[PDB]
Design an enzyme around this catalytic site. Structure first.
Site, PDB file in Angstrom:
ATOM      1  N   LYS A  99     -14.811  -8.361   7.375  1.00 32.19           N
ATOM      2  CA  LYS A  99     -13.493  -8.994   7.376  1.00 32.19           C
ATOM      3  C   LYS A  99     -12.976  -9.373   8.768  1.00 32.19           C
ATOM      4  O   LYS A  99     -12.074 -10.216   8.859  1.00 32.19           O
ATOM      5  CB  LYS A  99     -12.542  -8.267   6.408  1.00 32.19           C
ATOM      6  N   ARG A 122      -2.042  -6.486  -8.077  1.00 33.04           N
ATOM      7  CA  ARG A 122      -0.823  -7.294  -7.997  1.00 33.04           C
ATOM      8  C   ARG A 122      -1.015  -8.747  -8.452  1.00 33.04           C
ATOM      9  O   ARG A 122      -0.055  -9.409  -8.836  1.00 33.04           O
ATOM     10  CB  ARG A 122      -0.257  -7.196  -6.597  1.00 33.04           C
ATOM     11  N   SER A 172      -1.654  -8.372   3.183  1.00 30.46           N
ATOM     12  CA  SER A 172      -2.005  -7.930   4.527  1.00 30.46           C
ATOM     13  C   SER A 172      -2.437  -9.141   5.378  1.00 30.46           C
ATOM     14  O   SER A 172      -2.111  -9.243   6.563  1.00 30.46           O
ATOM     15  CB  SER A 172      -3.115  -6.887   4.466  1.00 30.46           C
ATOM     16  N   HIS A 185       0.839  -1.202   0.000  1.00 27.69           N
ATOM     17  CA  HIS A 185       0.000   0.000   0.000  1.00 27.69           C
ATOM     18  C   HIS A 185       0.866   1.241   0.000  1.00 27.69           C
ATOM     19  O   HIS A 185       0.574   2.209  -0.707  1.00 27.69           O
ATOM     20  CB  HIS A 185      -0.930   0.064   1.221  1.00 27.69           C
TER      21      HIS A 185
HETATM   22  C1  LIG Z   1     -13.746  -2.521  -1.412  1.00 31.31           C
HETATM   23  C2  LIG Z   1     -13.662  -3.052   0.019  1.00 31.31           C
HETATM   24  C3  LIG Z   1     -15.021  -3.615   0.414  1.00 31.31           C
HETATM   25  C4  LIG Z   1     -12.649  -4.264   0.045  1.00 31.31           C
HETATM   26  O1  LIG Z   1     -11.621  -4.135   1.057  1.00 31.31           O
HETATM   27  P1  LIG Z   1     -10.183  -3.844   0.391  1.00 31.31           P
HETATM   28  O2  LIG Z   1      -9.062  -3.880   1.402  1.00 31.31           O
HETATM   29  O3  LIG Z   1     -10.228  -2.503  -0.279  1.00 31.31           O
HETATM   30  O4  LIG Z   1     -10.010  -4.937  -0.742  1.00 31.31           O
HETATM   31  P2  LIG Z   1      -8.909  -5.985  -0.349  1.00 31.31           P
HETATM   32  O5  LIG Z   1      -7.661  -5.113  -0.302  1.00 31.31           O
HETATM   33  O6  LIG Z   1      -9.340  -6.487   1.017  1.00 31.31           O
HETATM   34  O7  LIG Z   1      -8.754  -7.193  -1.400  1.00 31.31           O
HETATM   35  C5  LIG Z   1      -7.753  -8.216  -1.213  1.00 31.31           C
HETATM   36  C6  LIG Z   1      -6.697  -7.768  -0.193  1.00 31.31           C
HETATM   37  O8  LIG Z   1      -7.142  -7.667   1.034  1.00 31.31           O
HETATM   38  C7  LIG Z   1      -6.874  -9.043   1.848  1.00 31.31           C
HETATM   39  N1  LIG Z   1      -8.175  -9.612   2.047  1.00 31.31           N
HETATM   40  C8  LIG Z   1      -9.195  -9.616   1.155  1.00 31.31           C
HETATM   41  N2  LIG Z   1     -10.295 -10.177   1.697  1.00 31.31           N
HETATM   42  C9  LIG Z   1      -9.991 -10.520   2.975  1.00 31.31           C
HETATM   43  C10 LIG Z   1     -10.765 -11.130   3.968  1.00 31.31           C
HETATM   44  N3  LIG Z   1     -12.097 -11.615   4.051  1.00 31.31           N
HETATM   45  N4  LIG Z   1     -10.251 -11.377   5.176  1.00 31.31           N
HETATM   46  C11 LIG Z   1      -8.963 -11.018   5.405  1.00 31.31           C
HETATM   47  N5  LIG Z   1      -8.193 -10.413   4.444  1.00 31.31           N
HETATM   48  C12 LIG Z   1      -8.702 -10.161   3.201  1.00 31.31           C
HETATM   49  C13 LIG Z   1      -5.890  -9.642   1.161  1.00 31.31           C
HETATM   50  O9  LIG Z   1      -4.726  -9.748   2.045  1.00 31.31           O
HETATM   51  C14 LIG Z   1      -5.473  -8.717  -0.033  1.00 31.31           C
HETATM   52  O10 LIG Z   1      -4.367  -7.930   0.129  1.00 31.31           O
HETATM   53  P3  LIG Z   1      -4.267  -6.524   0.937  1.00 31.31           P
HETATM   54  O11 LIG Z   1      -5.038  -6.662   2.227  1.00 31.31           O
HETATM   55  O12 LIG Z   1      -2.832  -6.265   1.313  1.00 31.31           O
HETATM   56  O13 LIG Z   1      -4.804  -5.288   0.237  1.00 31.31           O
HETATM   57  C15 LIG Z   1     -13.234  -1.874   0.951  1.00 31.31           C
HETATM   58  O14 LIG Z   1     -12.073  -1.318   0.512  1.00 31.31           O
HETATM   59  C16 LIG Z   1     -14.175  -0.706   0.750  1.00 31.31           C
HETATM   60  O15 LIG Z   1     -13.745   0.240   0.113  1.00 31.31           O
HETATM   61  N6  LIG Z   1     -15.546  -0.782   1.344  1.00 31.31           N
HETATM   62  C17 LIG Z   1     -16.563   0.250   1.211  1.00 31.31           C
HETATM   63  C18 LIG Z   1     -17.916  -0.508   1.315  1.00 31.31           C
HETATM   64  C19 LIG Z   1     -18.941  -0.025   0.270  1.00 31.31           C
HETATM   65  O16 LIG Z   1     -19.091   1.159   0.063  1.00 31.31           O
HETATM   66  N7  LIG Z   1     -19.756  -0.953  -0.469  1.00 31.31           N
HETATM   67  C20 LIG Z   1     -19.621  -2.378  -0.240  1.00 31.31           C
HETATM   68  C21 LIG Z   1     -19.734  -3.046  -1.611  1.00 31.31           C
HETATM   69  S1  LIG Z   1     -19.148  -1.876  -2.807  1.00 31.31           S
END
Ligand SMILES: CC(C)(COP(=O)(O)OP(=O)(O)OC[C@H]1O[C@@H](n2cnc3c(N)ncnc32)[C@H](O)[C@@H]1OP(=O)(O)O)[C@@H](O)C(=O)NCCC(=O)NCCS
Ligand SMILES: CC(C)(COP(=O)(O)OP(=O)(O)OC[C@H]1O[C@@H](n2cnc3c(N)ncnc32)[C@H](O)[C@@H]1OP(=O)(O)O)[C@@H](O)C(=O)NCCC(=O)NCCS
Ligand SMILES: CC(C)(COP(=O)(O)OP(=O)(O)OC[C@H]1O[C@@H](n2cnc3c(N)ncnc32)[C@H](O)[C@@H]1OP(=O)(O)O)[C@@H](O)C(=O)NCCC(=O)NCCS
Ligand SMILES: [Ca+2]
Lengths: 158, 157, 158
Positions: free
Chosen positions: B40, B89, B127, B16
């Protein structure tokens, strides 16, 4: 000289795993099946049951042995003195996960190699998770697991 | 151009961090939007995740950090940002990001979605894997900023 | 005499699902939508609600009917005397999972074909999970689901 460690949850061990182990036994002097305690999953079988089943399935292989562990893999491998990790690849999504685990282990255990095998086409597609779910609903899983494992699932589900 | 980089950041990593550095040099205003992601079950509280992100980015005058628990499509409008930033990535990341972007395009049609990839040096860092490794006493200091490393150390005892 | 069974959790049924059902309806004599209990995904809607919503969405299609089930799919499809599974494909990760599901069902129900459709591009990006999360946060999901489903999701989160 090569001691290979095959870590996994093995809940339960399948013919998918079994295929990779047969092949690793004919390739390495010493093969260690490392059953990970994986509490973040709520494994169907206890660690001890999963170790027992993996031993049962591999007892005919003199250079293969089974151990359970709950510690960090990168630490545990040093306790087992293995210089190679073995991981299976069955789907292209496995590769992605294994790629990041391998490079991450490369930082934690720089002297241990990560190598991969893919199971034969007949034993690909076998999901440990799908075997559990099928068995739980009374489906025949004898085509996916060793008879001893099959027996354990039956008894586990009444 | 005001760019919004949404994520769970549990915790924020060098992956990040790399993207934020690169985005800082590219846009006038970078907002790191830390999502309360209750499904999560985050290791760190939102407040902790915001503080860590702030700490890691405080040397960048055009980057600020905000926590939010609302719909991203609503929140980006409250922040008056016209661009989403997401990291790529792995190809499984891409499919998911592809699907989120086309849906946000329906919920926020006037907001652009763009992607960066971290350098190969940070490409493999999850992460999730950082949390699990730290939970077992593995050294994660090469995958994260020093403040994040301390936080992980204290988090488990 | 082709009877197709479309199994899924449908929590809730989306325009993505609906598109496939419209198309399968014009292609097969009898279309069965099999809503799985799926207790382990802890569905937002109860099985009965999910059946009802699916029924509502498909009531204009004379050769389509909807049923709930908690049993093994491979058993249930024989029980339905269906000779084809229908599954949707939108992303390559779906293909991986479906490929593996098809090969394990082929072992359990060898006389049942697995066939796939991809939704129209306008409905290809639609995830039921995302629909749930958007609705839970008070977002407009009316372009992703039928009105009755939109209405049901709103009530569900208050
Ligand atoms: C889009 C969103 C829901 C996803 O979370 P995110 O962190 O942005 O997406 P992720 O990064 O988790 O996707 C995979 C990554 O996360 C981890 N990860 C993904 N899903 C996971 C889970 N269930 N549990 C633990 N770790 C997870 C992975 O390690 C991977 O790498 P990173 O953490 O280093 O970034 C969040 O960022 C967001 O912006 N929510 C707003 C909610 C909203 O408005 N609407 C909901 C549907 S749009
Ligand atoms: C490699 C390791 C780290 C991760 O465990 P794992 O690889 O996910 O578990 P497996 O090796 O059995 O392979 C994945 C299995 O878990 C199941 N699985 C896949 N995704 C899952 C998910 N989200 N949740 C629960 N189970 C899942 C699958 O059924 C799969 O088995 P299958 O392919 O036979 O169907 C574990 O083997 C280990 O060695 N842990 C030691 C702890 C450690 O050193 N570090 C923590 C991060 S490295
Ligand atoms: C095999 C089966 C799980 C596949 O159906 P399905 O994929 O759930 O169908 P749906 O399209 O309705 O649901 C897919 C969603 O569930 C999500 N999902 C998959 N596994 C999940 C899990 N453990 N937990 C929560 N969500 C999950 C997927 O991510 C997907 O999300 P998305 O479509 O929003 O992107 C099941 O529904 C089926 O068709 N037959 C099961 C028969 C059986 O073996 N046992 C039945 C006893 S219930
Ligand atoms: Ca779906």
């Amino acid at each position: 000289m090569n001691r290979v460690l095959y870590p996994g949850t093995f809940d339960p061990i399948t013919k998918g795993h079994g295929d990779l182990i047969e092949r690793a036994s004919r390739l390495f002097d010493h093969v260690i099946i490392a059953v990970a305690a994986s509490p973040k999953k709520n494994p169907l079988f206890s660690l001890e049951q999963r170790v027992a089943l993996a031993q049962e399935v591999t007892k005919h292989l003199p250079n293969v042995e089974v151990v359970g562990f709950s510690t960090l893999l990168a630490h545990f491998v040093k306790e087992q003195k293995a210089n190679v990790f073995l991981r299976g690849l069955r789907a292209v999504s496995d590769f992605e996960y294994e790629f990041q685990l391998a490079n991450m282990n490369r930082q934690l255990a720089p002297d241990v190699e990560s190598m991969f095998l893919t199971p034969s086409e007949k034993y690909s597609f076998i999901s440990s998770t799908l075997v559990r779910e099928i068995a739980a609903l009374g489906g025949d899983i004898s085509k996916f697991v060793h008879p001893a494992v099959a027996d354990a699932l039956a008894e586990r589900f009444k």
